[PDB]
């Protein structure tokens, strides 16, 4: 059984593109039925790390469970969750964002150090997706995240990498100079994944529990 992505790419579908999500809901598939042309892909420009590896692993999975890895209402009390919308990902004429990610911004003129984690109790291998924002100008970065030396730290027994975003003026793509770079990992059952950052983090709103067999 294929997956029939249509105009959507895997990167667009894996992340929750707004014009994508209207057509996908499967649990046990084996193929792709996808067109590489991303009419509905990364609505925000950037690089999907280990994309090629990620298509192989998603292909042919027995189970597909989408669950709230970090509830938007409860997980981030000291940060703003309602202002992370853009026209690059606009839907039905209104600015929107990925259905599976979350753009934390400053709350009450402060971006406190954040520390949150998931201990994989689902007994199945879990797919966790996060992004790191790279703004175009220093003033936008200061307005949204306050700190000018931002850091993002993701640590697990299987994955460990610390991101340091930088302010770069990149050619305009989808009317946006800034970029988010997208990263992923697979969480073993019984393993914990930790996010520590002071800004520029696109937090995972939803994660996928799967079994390839």
């Amino acid at each position, epitope marked *: 059984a294929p997956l029939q992505l249509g105009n959507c790419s895997i990167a667009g579908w894996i992340l929750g593109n707004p014009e994508c999500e209207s057509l996908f809901s499967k649990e046990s598939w084996s193929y792709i039925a996808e067109t590489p042309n991303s009419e509905n892909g990364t609505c925000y420009p950037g690089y999907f790390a280990d994309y090629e590896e990620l298509r192989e692993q998603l292909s042919s999975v027995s189970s597909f469970e989408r669950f709230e890895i970090f509830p938007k209402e409860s997980s981030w009390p000291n940060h703003t969750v309602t202002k992370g*919308v853009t026209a690059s990902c606009s839907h039905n004429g209104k600015s929107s964002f990925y259905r599976n990610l979350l753009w934390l*911004t400053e709350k009450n003129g402060l971006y406190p150090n954040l520390s949150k984690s998931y201990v994989n109790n689902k007994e199945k291998e879990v797919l966790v997706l996060w992004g790191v924002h790279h703004p175009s100008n220093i003033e*936008d970065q200061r307005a949204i995240y306050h700190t000018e030396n931002a850091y993002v730290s993701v640590v697990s027994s299987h994955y460990s990498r610390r991101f340091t975003p930088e302010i770069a003026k990149r050619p305009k793509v989808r009317d946006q100079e800034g970029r988010i770079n997208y990263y992923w990992t697979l969480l073993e059952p019984g393993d914990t994944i930790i996010f520590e950052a002071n800004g520029n983090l696109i937090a995972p709103w939803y994660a996928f529990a799967l079994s390839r067999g």
Partner: antibody
Amino acid sequence: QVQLVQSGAEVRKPGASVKVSCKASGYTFTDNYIHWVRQAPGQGLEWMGWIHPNSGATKYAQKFEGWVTMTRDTSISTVYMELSRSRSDDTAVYYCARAGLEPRSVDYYFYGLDVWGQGTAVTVSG
Amino acid sequence: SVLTQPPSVSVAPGQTATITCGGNNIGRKRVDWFQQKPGQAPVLVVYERFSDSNSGTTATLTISRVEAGDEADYYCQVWDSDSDHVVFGGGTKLTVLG
């Protein structure tokens, strides 16, 4: 509901530090920015700067950087602008406004000036 | 930076009034309009009669069925990221004839 009260009109000789007070009620002082603008008599307004009570961070316009100093006291929920070194052209009415228009998008992340103060008349002529 | 507004506009009562605010790269940026009656602290224009429509290099504020109380001084405002400064417009003395 929310309101901003300002110190009354002070008259001073040129070269003297004049300080204006702006007090906030009906909202948690730590929440929003407070900007200061000035309006020369019969002219338009000129943005001067802003300060956030939660962080204490300040930011000034180029023309006003150096001589103006903006402080705050969370305990009394009051924000201050000090006008060190007065000169005649500073005679104007000075307003304080809170930035309560929350931005909708990350593209334009700027809180707009929703509620203003009564205005303080600073007169310097000697 | 350097937003430009008209010195004065005159509209007959019950008609429509348009105020032009010109500057570079208004584009994605929203424009806040402030209304200052004489001897009064300016207040933000929030919004049937009041409506804005920004397109490209110019933002416009339109008032429908102008009234005597609507008459005042109008001021557009935009934050300039590069200059890091909040920019205020020069000013519009709208005059509902009456």
